[PDB]
Structures are given as C-alpha cells and as structure tokens.
RNA sequence: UGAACUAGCCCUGGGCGCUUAAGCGUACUACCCAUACCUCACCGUCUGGGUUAGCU
C-alpha cells in the first residue's frame, strides 16, 4: 500500500540538500561582502 | 618731384548658362551622401563556455 521512494532519489536529495546549503551559506557572505565593497 | 621694382589678375602673341560670379584666392559657419564609421535586428562561419543519481 505504501511505495517507498527510490534509493537513488534519497541519494540525490542528500546531495542536493548539501549543495543548497553551500549556496545559501555563500549567499549571505556574498551580500555582506557586496555591501562592504560598495561602501569602499 | 617722380622714377623704377615686386607680386597677381586681363588681352595680343559635361551642358545650359554665369560676371561686385554660378570665375579665381583666403576665412567662416550651415548643408548633401558611399558597400565606409556607429547602434540595433537577422543569416552563416569561427572561437570560448554551460548542460546527467537526466530535479515538474
């Protein structure tokens, strides 16, 4: 009755989740550096 | 008082027309338009880059 998600989907989701974390982490830093650069 | 000299125009030796030019010299602003220059679109060629746990 319950169809488990494919295991390749779980592996891709873990990889995509990690890549999104780096993008967001390097996006808040990008905003701060841009504000400091623009003042300079 | 003149004398010559110097330089330049005139005479003798594309068409229509032009004469303080529509010729010649110089200066100055306007204007005309090439397949050239600029901006854009499109064609093609070349060069460089991206694109797969193929993510509704």
Swiss-Prot record:
The chain holds residues 11 to 50 of 250 of the full protein. The gene is rpl702. Component of the ribosome, a large ribonucleoprotein complex responsible for the synthesis of proteins in the cell. The small ribosomal subunit (SSU) binds messenger RNAs (mRNAs) and translates the encoded message by selecting cognate aminoacyl-transfer RNA (tRNA) molecules. The large subunit (LSU) contains the ribosomal catalytic site termed the peptidyl transferase center (PTC), which catalyzes the formation of peptide bonds, thereby polymerizing the amino acids delivered by tRNAs into a polypeptide chain. There are 3 genes for uL30 in S.pombe. Belongs to the universal ribosomal protein uL30 family. This is Large ribosomal subunit protein uL30B. Transmembrane segments: none annotated. It is found in: Cytoplasm; Nucleus, Nucleolus. Component of the large ribosomal subunit (LSU). Mature yeast ribosomes consist of a small (40S) and a large (60S) subunit. The 40S small subunit contains 1 molecule of ribosomal RNA (18S rRNA) and at least 33 different proteins. The large 60S subunit contains 3 rRNA molecules (25S, 5.8S and 5S rRNA) and at least 46 different proteins.
């Amino acid at each position: 009755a319950s169809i488990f998600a494919p295991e390749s989907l779980l592996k891709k989701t873990k990889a995509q989740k990690q890549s999104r974390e780096q993008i967001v982490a390097a996006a808040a830093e990008k905003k701060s550096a841009r504000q400091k650069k623009r003042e300079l």
